[PDB]
RNA sequence: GGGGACUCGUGAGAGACUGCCGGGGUCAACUCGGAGGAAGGUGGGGAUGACGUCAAGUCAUCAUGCCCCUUAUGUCCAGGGCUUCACACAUGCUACAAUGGCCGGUACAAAGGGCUGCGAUGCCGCGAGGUUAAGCGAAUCCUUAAAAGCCGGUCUCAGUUCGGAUCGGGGUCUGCAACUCGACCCCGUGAAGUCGGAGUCGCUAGUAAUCGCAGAUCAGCAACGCUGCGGUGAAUACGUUCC
């Protein structure tokens, strides 16, 4: 069976169908760099990739959707770690220390009654 | 409201944009909605008793 | 480089440099300046006593400029004055005349602050 | 109405108070109650009394004030000075 | 085929379940097919009052009401399970549709 | 608080720079979210300032610091019917943030026209001692050495 | 066509309890730190307001004891008023620009609304809109293009290509009707404002800050309000001396 995971970070989902290749990131019918343009969320989609040892291979392409650029970002991370345990049950103990099977429960804090934001109160004015 | 203005609100005025709802229950003019037909006041007694279906507090 | 009168800033591209005309806008520069064939991306510098005069007859013949669209404006105020209207009464006095709100506010039909 | 699709308006009770007059050629002021109506080029030469909330104003229909509404030349609300 | 289309929707859960699972279980017992309940996205309705009739306007109640929709999808045609689908005993709470 | 330290939070390393302080500095610089474009005002600058002198400048950057880092400050305090100033030690964590948010603070009130030469100005005028944020530096400390008899107040 | 792999929708379940290990403590409650784990000590957030205080608020949601009006304080309607304006305060918005304005190209959302409706597509109009009409009682069709962001070009510190108040002209839509007193569009005009005195407010993490989108009321709308939704995303907390 081919090679099926999933990560999601605050409302992005990825699904990454990680492959072993030679190293290409064809994220939804697109490239890397077409993609994130910016270099700091390139830094974390091959930050598992690097702890591991193992970006010169295992060429993935996954289908993105929901959130943002960063959110879609943060989701891929999580899909190559959980991907890369499939493959190869030892480096666990290496992948856990560096806080990447974390999903890291952060979501937005809804708006509350009475406040302008979820914490954010009027003036107060005492007279 | 007034007696004479709830039965006003139920008939058919001239001018067919001069029609406006009231609250079914009490005569209210202000803050009825339109899928109950109640105001604000009216929609709080009904879904604390039960008496209307679908309706109850909610939390997320 | 005077053009109705109204003498044309120098070192200024000529789709702003037009709008120091009374009467001419950005919109009305972006067509004063495609009957005529300039280019937008020009500095008023470099521009051609020939091409100057290209642009002395599209205006004249077709916007409204300095002077006698000044005093329409003054003549329509004036005309809601004598009329007896409602915004001729609220021309009189410095207030908006456009149902503003006149409780905290309407600052610039009035003066500054006085605090009696 | 406003649009330049439905014309002007004027109501059906105030033109039939003019057409009325405007064919055997009498200056009788009327009394009206309709400041929504809009001076049209009949009512040029013509003096309507408009109800401003207390009384009924004289207005006075001379030549130019043809694009207006009938109600702009009665000020509803009084007002001096503060002082 | 995809003849006969039932839209079920209720108000609330363990009545429009309870409704498909075990109701309309009975034309299969005919000789027929579904194709089980299939869950649909529920609609969440939202609503927010005072809670004093008079000036307190930072205090509120949030009311919801949640429309839960299944949907059913018997296959096979017969003539005889036409009226097996009219005198079924269903709930007041539950609306079905024949589409 | 009342109920003891809180947990600071980590920096991830910068992906074009390989050091802590430079991701460090992005975060002085950011406003309003808009992270990648003070992302673009700081490799900016750092490039713009080994065009004037060919050193690596994060190798710039720390001699940067290391002119206007803070050793004393000069935190107050009410003793009597008169307040006064009292020197106290700067850590080590705190002389490199006070000093990021004196880089990035004087930098927005400087005579140029970018941000991006605004910022590469201080950076080469505090790596040789003569910008304006280094003259904060001989401020804070002239108003820490003038107070030394108060260093017997310390909360 | 088809598929049950993945996601999602939503039903029933598992999961976190100091359960396990080490140190401190009457072997106590507990406490500091490790292993596993998606999550660790209440995981984050909501709903939830004890006995009572303020003769706190509402006789104008409703209900009501007394007192009062009954050819008027009842009641119908047309106009006007709640929108005034030497001023004073409070809550917000847009700003004073280069971490920006404008022009062109190009990505990425969530939660909602729709038959007295949603108006695709095509055409006409500079545009708000007009007209024809396919689809859809909606995980199906429509609302729907998210905007900040990214790339490139221009402006060069100026009361300006910042600001968009005010005023002139011409329009559209809703409605019996837009004068008093509606939003929206176009053309022109281009005021105050160059970071705010004493004082004072909010916020400890997906927070503040900032950028848009949807709803309820509603023919239309003075929606910059309220209640929600997601995108990008900080800096600090030595400490209890002082308020
Ligand atoms: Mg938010
Ligand atoms: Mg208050
Ligand atoms: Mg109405
Ligand atoms: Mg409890
Ligand atoms: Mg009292
Ligand atoms: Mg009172
Ligand atoms: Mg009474
Ligand atoms: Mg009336
Ligand atoms: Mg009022
Ligand atoms: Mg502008
Ligand atoms: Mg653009
Ligand atoms: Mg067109
Ligand atoms: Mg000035
Ligand atoms: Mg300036
Ligand atoms: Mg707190
Ligand atoms: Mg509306
Ligand atoms: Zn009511």
Redesign the interface.
């Given at each position: 069976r081919p090679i099926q995971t999933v990560g999601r970070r605050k409302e992005a989902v990825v699904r990454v169908r990680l492959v072993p290749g030679t190293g290409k990131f064809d994220l939804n019918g697109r490239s890397l760099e077409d993609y994130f343009p910016?270099?700091?969320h390139?830094?974390?989609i091959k930050a598992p990739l690097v702890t591991v040892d193992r970006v010169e291979s295992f060429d993935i392409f996954a289908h993105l959707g929901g959130g943002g650029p960063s959110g879609q970002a943060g989701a891929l991370r999580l899909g190559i770690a959980r991907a890369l345990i499939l493959v190869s049950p030892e480096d666990r103990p290496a992948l856990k220390k560096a806080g990447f099977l974390t999903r890291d429960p952060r979501a937005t804090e809804?708006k509350k009654?009475?406040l302008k934001k979820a914490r954010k109160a009027p003036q107060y004015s005492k007279r | 409201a007034k007696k004479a203005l709830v039965n006003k609100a139920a008939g058919k005025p001239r001018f067919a944009v001069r029609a406006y709802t009231r609250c079914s229950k009490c005569g209210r003019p202000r803050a009825v909605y339109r899928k109950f037909g109640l105001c604000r006041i009216c929609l709080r007694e009904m879904a604390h008793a039960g008496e209307l279906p679908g309706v109850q507090k909610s939390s997320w | 480089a005077r053009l109705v009168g109204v003498d044309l800033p120098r070192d200024k591209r000529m789709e702003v440099a037009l709008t120091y005309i009374f009467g001419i806008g950005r919109t009305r520069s972006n067509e004063i300046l495609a009957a005529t064939g300039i280019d937008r991306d020009l500095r008023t510098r470099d521009l051609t006593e020939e091409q100057l005069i290209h642009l002395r007859d599209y205006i004249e013949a077709n916007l409204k400029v300095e002077g006698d669209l000044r005093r329409e404006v003054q003549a329509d105020i004036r005309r809601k004055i004598e009329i007896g209207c409602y915004q001729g009464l609220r021309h009189r006095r410095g207030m908006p005349v456009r149902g503003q709100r006149t409780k905290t506010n309407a600052r610039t039909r009035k003066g500054p602050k006085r605090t009696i | 109405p406003r649009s330049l699709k439905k014309g002007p308006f004027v109501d059906e009770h105030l033109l039939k108070k003019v057409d009325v007059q405007n064919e055997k050629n009498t200056k009788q002021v009327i009394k009206t109650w309709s400041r929504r109506s809009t001076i049209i080029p009949d009512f040029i030469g013509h003096t309507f009394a408009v109800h401003d909330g207390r009384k009924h104003v004289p207005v006075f229909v001379t030549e130019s004030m043809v694009g207006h509404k009938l109600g702009e030349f009665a000020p509803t609300r009084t007002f001096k000075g503060h002082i | 085929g995809q003849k006969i289309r039932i839209r079920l929707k209720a108000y609330d859960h363990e009545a429009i379940d309870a409704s498909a699972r075990k109701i309309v279980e009975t034309v299969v017992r005919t000789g027929a097919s579904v194709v089980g309940p299939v869950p649909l996205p529920t609609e969440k309705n939202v609503y927010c009052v005072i809670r004093s009739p008079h000036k307190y306007k930072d205090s509120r109640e949030h009311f919801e009401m949640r429309t839960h929709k299944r949907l059913i999808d018997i296959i096979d045609p017969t003539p005889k399970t036409v009226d097996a689908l009219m005198r079924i005993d269903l709930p007041a709470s539950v609306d079905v549709n024949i589409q | 608080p009342r109920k003891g330290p809180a947990p600071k939070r980590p920096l991830v390393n910068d992906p074009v720079y390989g050091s802590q302080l430079v991701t460090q500095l992005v975060n002085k610089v950011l406003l309003k979210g808009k992270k990648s474009l003070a992302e673009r005002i700081v490799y900016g600058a750092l490039e713009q300032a080994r065009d004037k002198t060919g050193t690596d400048p994060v190798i710039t950057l720390k001699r940067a610091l290391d002119n206007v880092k803070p050793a004393l400050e000069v935190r107050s305090r009410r003793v009597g019917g008169a307040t006064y100033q009292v020197p106290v030690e700067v850590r080590p964590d705190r002389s490199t943030t006070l000093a990021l948010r004196w880089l990035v603070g004087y930098s927005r009130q400087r005579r140029e026209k970018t941000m991006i030469e605004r910022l590469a100005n201080e950076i080469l005028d505090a790596s040789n001692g003569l910008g304006a944020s280094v003259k904060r530096r001989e401020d804070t400390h002239k108003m820490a050495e003038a107070n030394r008899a108060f260093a017997h107040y310390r909360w």
């Open positions: 910016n270099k700091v390139q830094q974390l809804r009654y009475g | - | - | - | - | -």
